[PDB]
Symmetry: C3
Subunit: 87 residues, 3 copies
């Protein structure tokens, strides 16, 4: 069981990604009860980062399953695969 | 051994959490030399995030031991157990 | 395999550090294609953080091999070894 944590804004919002049992899930704080978010992808290891633009939060989550890392992107309109490729 | 690193401000301040065995400890930098910080909790994995607000630094450390993640909170007055629960 | 991710600026720039076996490498995004970065050091675990000073982006990468964590620093002019020592 392994986590990654990000936050933004002054509320703040927090996201905690947990890799366990080959899956990565997402717990979210937006100022009230913690909740389970829409992020759900395969992986045994996770990292994440985020930034703000004028009218969106952008999240990049790096999900590693074995020898391959997949980037997952939030830009306000659902989770989409990113263009990241490894070395 | 596994680490998590955060930073804030212009100086900057940096905090590095290290899980070794089932203990997490904290090394700190505030602009001079590194020192050992007040954080000390159980865990074999760690992540962390931080933000500035309200004339304070807020840090959240997510410490996983025994299949369970505990959130530990610094808001200027000691490390306190947070509301976070997992999936 | 295990990763750490950081980001800055509006573009944004992203760096993803991957520990595979006992080597840490870096992939970079600055608004067009991903490319392989200058960072290359020993380690079985990586974390990272960054900040903007007025005049440059600063990155700190914490590379652990065994019971020892080394800090590597980017301050605009190559990677240098940081003062960080462990507990
Ligand atoms: C109260 C507090 O958190 N003090 C730390 C201080 O925080 C500042 C905020 O209060 C605020 O003014 O914003 C600025 C940044 O704009 C600071 O974040 O920051 C200084 C460094 O500039 C720290 O040295 C202070 O650290 C705490 O100091 C108190 C003094 O009573 C105690 O010694 C604490 O043990 C010490 O905490 C250390 O830092 C905190 C953030 C945790 O990592 C602790 O585990 C660690 O020991
Ligand atoms: C569009 C957007 O990014 N909205 C953010 C809010 O979170 C999403 O809200 C939509 C409805 O507008 C849904 O409820 C959605 O499930 C929420 O997504 C959650 O947060 C995002 C960032 C991801 O982490 C996702 O996996 C997760 O479920 C959010 O409540 C507020 C907080 O201020 O920000 C909005 O921008
Ligand atoms: C939102 C925030 O940062 N608030 C800080 C306080 O933490 C919250 O305090 C209330 C009671 O007043 C509840 O205990 C709540 O659970 C606390 O939330 C904590 O922080 C948020 C961001 C999440 O990480 C959550 O899981 C965690 O429990 C804190 O007590 C005061 C102390 O001065 O500072 C506030 O800024
Ligand atoms: C500071 C910064 O973001 N620079 C970006 C350029 O990156 C550096 O470019 C120089 C040539 O001018 C060198 O190729 C150097 O290796 C590049 O450094 C890269 O970024 C820094 C922050 C580290 O991560 C380092 O290991 C990595 O190689 C970049 O080439 C250009 C165009 O993509 O954009 C600049 O933002
Ligand atoms: C005075 C100061 O803060 N200097 C920063 C430069 O790095 C530090 O330089 C001093 C001078 O003795 C020490 O060598 C110090 O250990 C250096 O710190 C480095 O960076 C900090 C943030 C930590 O990561 C530390 O472990 C690391 O060694 C630094 O080169 C410049 C960057 O342009 O910033 C100076 O403020
Ligand atoms: C920050 C990057 O986000 C995505 O890349 C975006 C592209 O998919 C595309 O939307 C162009 C404009 O059309 O903008 C890019 O920023 C990811 O694919 C990429 O890996 C970065 O995370």
């Amino acid at each position: 069981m392994q986590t990654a944590a990000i936050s933004w804004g002054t509320t703040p919002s927090i996201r905690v990604y947990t890799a366990n049992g080959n899956k990565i899930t997402e717990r979210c704080y937006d100022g009230s009860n913690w909740y389970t978010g829409a992020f759900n992808q395969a992986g045994d290891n996770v990292s994440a980062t985020c930034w703000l633009s004028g009218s969106a939060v952008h999240i990049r989550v790096y999900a590693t399953s074995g020898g391959s890392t997949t980037e997952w992107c939030w830009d306000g309109d659902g989770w989409t695969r990113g263009a990241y490729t490894g070395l």
